[PDB]
Design a protein around this ligand. Structure first.
Ligand code: HEM
Ligand SMILES: CC(C)(C)OC(=O)N[C@@H](CS[C@@H](Cc1ccccc1)C(=O)NCc1cccnc1)Cc1ccccc1
Length: 451
């Protein structure tokens, strides 16, 4: 202290920080609003302080490529630490430097296209469960809360695709697994007081509810020794030039994978159904393409999913409006200069995806939901370091091809059987949580009708 003079010295503009808090009072309207304002207020780069932590935002595409791709292993390897995490230190998304690079290698084959194609049948099964649970609510003309029914589905896929466990979480039952995965203001006090993280680490408070972790750690070791197609197997087969995945390291990835796909798959689906209900032509155009590819409600396959181009456009455009990461971040581990700009060690470098995804300077009518932006005609003009819903470079989203496949399979099955219409209780226009997550203020509730 006080690092509140850093950006002023480097000649980088940005809002004036208050003592101790830095700029965090400016988050009262959410991260996203704050990044847009800073983008409009200050232009291509700017700096601010999460408490005493300097954060440098960058928006130039070349400079974003340098940070995410060119200098990843060498400088910008790690995300901003948050804690306390206990043993979750060994999870790929949290691990650092050579330990991370190792975990990436051990888990990357698990997410190939070829392995993903063998998971499609298991992913296809619970699409049927989703429809039947939907129809029970469609035949009873009662508005439906999407996060529930989609979560029930996303939960169904996860437990099976990761552990082989096979539940209808929505109804079926208090089956022992649905629950420790139910625990699926603290993190702000972390920002003003990030000097307390190692305190909680010596106290062993895990941000991961210590009981969940205790359940799965033993739950995993039950599964391991009962077997001795899914992620757990794909990892068990891996630990059979890098030290094999240890037994606790394996448990921690599974947790990463359960969360990774739970609220993301679920919330993105709910974003898509929201837009599709408030844009009936896009819903119809989509159902037409689905029926042409899969006549007679033919079951989707890996190859027919990749065949649907407008399905791809609707997905991409929703992720434009609602990039659930909001920001991409990397810690500067060494004094460096990138694209003619000095960047001191210890600075956090931030890529404001949300702000970039809604920047009029790259997007005509950036608030409108317009899938044609992603037509094979137009998709070529889109700068991949502006549109970055899965990140970029060696630490991009390892689950990208799975998530897209998983969501597309869900949508196809549901649009083959139902049309979705706004209720009087639908929030139009949907508003984002002023909080710290990308979620609607109020949950998306719609009317479901059988075709
Ligand atoms: C719509 C769904 C998803 C979206 C939009 C998404 C987006 C993102 C983004 C933006 C990042 C940071 C990328 C970067 O820093 O360059 C990330 C990281 C990551 N995602 Fe996803 N994600 C999704 C689903 C999933 C799923 C289903 C998994 C399943 C296992 C997964 C596993 C991961 C992991 C492990 C990381 C960190 C990888 C690393 O640091 O080595 N994600 N995701
Ligand atoms: C304090 C706040 C909430 C701001 O930060 C966190 O704690 N969240 C990070 C910790 S990483 C790690 C954290 C996590 C595990 C379980 C529950 C909640 C968080 C993770 O892998 N989650 C998977 C994921 C989510 C989405 C896509 N792909 C993968 C999450 C993350 C990581 C990379 C990109 C975007 C988000």
């Amino acid at each position: 202290t006080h690092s509140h003079g850093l950006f002023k010295k480097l000649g980088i503009p940005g809002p004036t920080p208050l003592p101790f808090l830095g700029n965090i009072l400016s988050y009262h309207k959410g991260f996203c609003m704050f990044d847009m304002e800073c983008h409009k207020k200050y232009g291509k780069v700017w700096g601010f302080y999460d408490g005493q932590q300097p954060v440098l935002a960058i928006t130039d595409p070349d400079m974003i490529k340098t940070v995410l791709v060119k200098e990843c292993y060498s400088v910008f390897t790690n995300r901003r630490p948050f804690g306390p995490v206990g043993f979750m230190k060994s999870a790929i998304s949290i691990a650092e430097d050579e330990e991370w690079k190792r975990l990436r290698s051990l888990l990357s084959p698990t997410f190939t296209s070829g392995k993903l194609k063998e998971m499609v049948p298991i992913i296809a099964q619970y699409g049927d469960v989703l429809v039947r649970n939907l129809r029970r609510e469609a035949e009873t003309g009662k508005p439906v809360t999407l996060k529930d029914v989609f979560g029930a589905y996303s939960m169904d896929v996860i437990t099976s695709t990761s552990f082989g466990v096979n539940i209808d979480s929505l109804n079926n039952p208090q089956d022992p697994f649905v629950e420790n995965t139910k625990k699926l203001p603290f993190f702000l006090s972390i920002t003003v007081f990030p000097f307390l993280i190692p305190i909680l680490e010596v106290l062993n408070i895990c941000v991961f509810p210590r009981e969940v972790t205790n359940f799965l750690r033993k739950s995993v070791k039950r599964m391991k020794e009962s077997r001795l197609v899914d992620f757990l197997q794909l990892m068990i087969d891996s630990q059979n030039s890098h030290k094999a995945l240890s037994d606790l390291e394996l448990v921690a990835q599974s947790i990463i994978f359960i969360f990774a796909g739970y609220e993301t798959t679920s919330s993105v689906l709910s974003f898509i159904m929201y837009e599709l209900a408030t844009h009936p032509d896009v819903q119809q155009k989509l159902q037409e393409e689905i029926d042409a590819v899969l006549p007679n409600k033919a079951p989707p396959t890996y190859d027919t999913v990749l065949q649907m181009e407008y399905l791809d456009m609707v997905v991409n455009e929703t992720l434009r409006l609602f990039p659930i990461a909001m920001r991409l971040e990397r810690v500067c581990k060494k004094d460096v200069e990138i694209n003619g700009m000095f960047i001191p060690k210890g600075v956090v470098v931030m890529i404001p995806s949300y702000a970039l995804h809604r920047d009029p300077k790259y997007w005509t009518e950036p608030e409108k939901f317009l899938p044609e932006r992603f037509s094979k005609k137009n998709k070529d003009n889109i700068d991949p370091y502006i549109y970055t819903p899965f990140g970029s470079g060696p630490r991009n989203c390892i689950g990208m091809r799975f998530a897209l496949m998983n969501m597309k399979l869900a949508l196809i099955r549901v649009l083959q059987n139902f049309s979705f219409k706004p209720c009087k209780e639908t929030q139009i226009p949907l508003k984002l949580s002023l909080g710290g997550l990308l979620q609607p203020e109020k949950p998306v509730v719609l009317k479901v009708e059988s075709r």
